[PDB]
């Protein structure tokens, strides 16, 4: 426990730094905020454009011309601007449905990842997944996926079974392994060898069909008790 706490406490820390020293983490959020504003200015600037009208001020045409003139012009402005809304609208509808599709991806992580523990690999961030902490951020949300990534490997020599008496044994959970002398049955993600006794292993049929079985003796828990 102690260790993990530190690893986790430490791990938190770096985030501050990852965030403090970098503007390029939040690009996504940072972007959305642009594209909107980006798309407004465009929408606005369109006000200043002639669209082939004599001028992009409405009241000028009004001022200078007699309306049956302005009628024809102010079309183009209207025709022009009116169009230029639909462009702006549509762009939103599309964009806005690119968010709606990224809400649900949050509304999911928030549900599965936070509220649960997610089994879906690399949904909740590289590694097996432990928990998560949301943090809002402006027009956004930010998860901190605390995940568990294994580290230091040791080769071993595995064998899928064991002939004990000619019965097989297969591990009940996680591989057999040996370091080359004694065979050990371990759990699969964290080397923690254990002597092999019938409680680690269940028996299926006789040996031979197995491909790669190896010899060994599977100690009996009971026998020492029956030893007396």
């Amino acid at each position: 426990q102690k260790l993990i706490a530190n690893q986790f406490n430490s791990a938190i820390g770096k985030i501050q730094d990852s965030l403090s020293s970098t503007a390029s983490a939040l690009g996504k959020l940072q972007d959305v905020v642009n594209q909107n504003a980006q798309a407004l200015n465009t929408l606005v600037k369109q006000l200043s454009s002639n669209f082939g009208a004599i001028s992009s001020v409405l009241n000028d045409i009004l001022s200078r011309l007699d309306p049956p003139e302005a009628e024809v012009q102010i079309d183009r402005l209207i025709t022009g601007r009116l169009q230029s809304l639909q462009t702006y609208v549509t762009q939103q509808l599309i964009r806005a449905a690119e968010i709606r599709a990224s809400a649900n991806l949050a509304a999911t992580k928030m549900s599965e990842c936070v509220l649960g523990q997610s089994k879906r690999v690399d949904f909740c961030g590289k590694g097996y997944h432990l928990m998560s902490f949301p943090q809002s951020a402006p027009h956004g949300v930010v998860f901190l996926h605390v995940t568990y990534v294994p580290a230091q490997e040791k080769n071993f020599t595995t064998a899928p079974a064991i002939c004990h008496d000619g019965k097989a044994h297969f591990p009940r959970e996680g591989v057999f392994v040996s370091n080359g002398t004694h065979w050990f049955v371990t759990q699969r993600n964290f080397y923690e060898p254990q002597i092999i006794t019938t409680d680690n292993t269940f028996v299926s049929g006789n040996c031979d069909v197995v491909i790669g079985i190896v010899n060994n003796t599977v100690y009996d828990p009971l026998q020492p008790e029956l030893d007396s």
Binding site: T147, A151, E153
Partner: protein
């Protein structure tokens, strides 16, 4: 100092036989980058950084120790 590419005519960078991770991806696998004096080099990108796992039909490799990362999304 012109390097004709699969992408187009690249002017002002120095082809490099070496291959590094991608930096300013250009096209067709050509990723420019700034470093060496220094000038912009344009070099076929290295998908990843190679590895090969020693497989062998009896050989398993079990992590002994772990980490806890924290990432962000």
């Amino acid at each position: 100092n012109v390097f004709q590419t699969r992408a187009g005519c690249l002017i002002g960078a120095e082809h490099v036989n070496n291959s590094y991770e991608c930096d300013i991806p250009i096209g067709a696998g050509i990723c420019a980058s700034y470093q060496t004096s220094q000038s912009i080099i344009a070099y076929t990108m290295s998908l990843g950084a190679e590895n090969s796992v020693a497989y062998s039909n009896n050989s398993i490799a079990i992590p002994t120790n772990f980490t806890i990362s924290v990432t962000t999304e």
